[PDB]
Structure of ADP-ribosylating binary toxin binding subunit CdtB:
Amino acid sequence: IVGVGMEKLIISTNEHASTDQGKTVSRATTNSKTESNT
Amino acid sequence: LSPLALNTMDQFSSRLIPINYDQLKKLDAGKQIKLETTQVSGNFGTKN
């Protein structure tokens, strides 16, 4: 007469976690020329 | 000789033994994993 008895149950959550960090460097130059006549 | 490595759990030795995230948080905190042998199968020799 064989029986089975459970002692404890373990749960493993099936998640996916990510972590991202970045850095940026930029530089711009503008040459503006304007003519006015009146 | 060095000890042998037990690192697969399926019958065809194609799947590594995983652990949970909380189990890893236990492992890196210094807790150890113990090994218990429950049964051993084997063979004896006779004469035909």
Observations:
- DSSP finds no helices and no strands in chain A.
- Chain A touches chain B through three residues (CB under 8 Å).
- The CA atoms of residues 25 and 31 of chain A lie 21 Å apart.
- The two ends of chain A are 111 Å apart (CA to CA).
